[PDB]
Amino acid sequence: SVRIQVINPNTSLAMTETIGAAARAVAAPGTEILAVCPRAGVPSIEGHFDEAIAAVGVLEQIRAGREQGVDGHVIACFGDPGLLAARELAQGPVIGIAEAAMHMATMVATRFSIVTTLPRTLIIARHLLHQYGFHQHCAALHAIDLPVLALEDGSGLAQEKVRERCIRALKEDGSGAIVLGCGGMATLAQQLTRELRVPVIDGVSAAVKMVESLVALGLATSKHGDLAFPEKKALSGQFQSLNPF
């Protein structure tokens, strides 16, 4: 009855499976998850260059989603790459996983801490905090200092480091909740929540619920003004498939 396109903006099939599984586990009855990734792009997103590439992959999948008539979309990278570009292109609502996780966090705690991957992604998270208006609600940001794909490498090392940093954060930061700063951490939310007895929030699941909520409310992206469909233009080269509408 409700179809939600969950877009992994990176090309890693491994991470697409982690993300898709987290999406399906919290999905309401009647919700179908379509877990996808771009055909062309970058295997993981860890910086501004990666984000700009991922944004175009997101747009490719948004187009696919829209021609399939999906009810909504999630952007399952913590940089929310191409969020506003996607909202212009899409009919249904588009929710980012950083956006969704941060929003939820303000509903269950006064302040939250972020636990992310590499140090260079911290500035990306900071920018989103300021953009979404949640900077005052974030007590601290931490990186585990391992690449994104370390979460899929089978060792459990990155998972253990997330745990240790969550404990440290709750002891030191003066925050009441954790926001996980990576789509690949989606699996850890429920276990850390039960273990640490505080909300540990995965944006993937959170974004699924937001799309479902918006659909049930009969609310979709405003096509009045800023997020109107793109002006009709001739797109050249590899971009020509992006807006057939």
- Please report how close the Cβ of residue 17 comes to a second copy at its closest, in angstroms: 18
Window 73-102: contact mask with Cl ion (x via CB under 5 A) = ----xx------------------------
Could you say which of 85, 114, 180, 185 contacts a second copy (CB under 8 A)? 85
Q: Which of 32, 68, 136, 160 binds a second copy (CB under 8 A)?
A: 136
Amino acid at 85: A
Strand pairing category for 72-75 and 94-96: parallel
For 133, counting Cβ atoms within 10 Å of its Cβ (0-12 exposed, 13-18 middle, 19+ buried), the class is: exposed
Asked if 104 is part of the footprint of Cl ion (rule: CB under 5 A), the reply reads no
Q: Using alpha carbons only, what angle is made at residue 202 by residues 58 and 126, rounded to the nearest 5 degrees?
A: 70
Taking CB within 5 to 8 Å according to partner kind, which of Cl ion, a second copy, none is near residue 222? a second copy
CA dist 94 → 49, 146, 208, 210 (Å): 22, 29, 10, 9
Q: Quick one: which segment of 13-21, 83-91, 153-161, 180-188 binds a second copy (CB under 8 A)?
A: 83-91
**The residue count for the chain:** 245
Q: Which of residues 61-80 bind a second copy (CB under 8 A)?
A: none
Number of residues that bind Cl ion (CB under 5 A): 4
Asked if residue 168 binds a second copy (CB under 8 A), the reply is: no
Binding residue (CB under 8 A) for a second copy from 15, 134, 166, 187: 134
**Listed ranges 24-32, 35-43, 182-190, 199-207: which one lies at the site for Cl ion (CB under 5 A):** 182-190
Residue selected from 166, 182, 189, 192 as contacting Cl ion according to rule CB under 5 A: 182
**Contact string (CB under 8 A) for a second copy, positions 184-223, x = contact:** ------x--x---xxx-x---xx--xx-xxx-xxxxxxxx
Q: State in angstroms the smallest separation of the CB of 1 from Cl ion.
A: 29
Q: Return d(Cα 67, Cα 243) in angstroms, integer.
A: 10
Closest CA to 243 of 89, 94, 91, 55: 89
Q: Is 235 in the site for a second copy (CB under 8 A)?
A: yes
Q: How far is the CB of 183 from Cl ion (least distance, A)?
A: 4
Where do contacts with Cl ion occur on this chain (CB under 5 A)? Answer: 77-78, 182-183
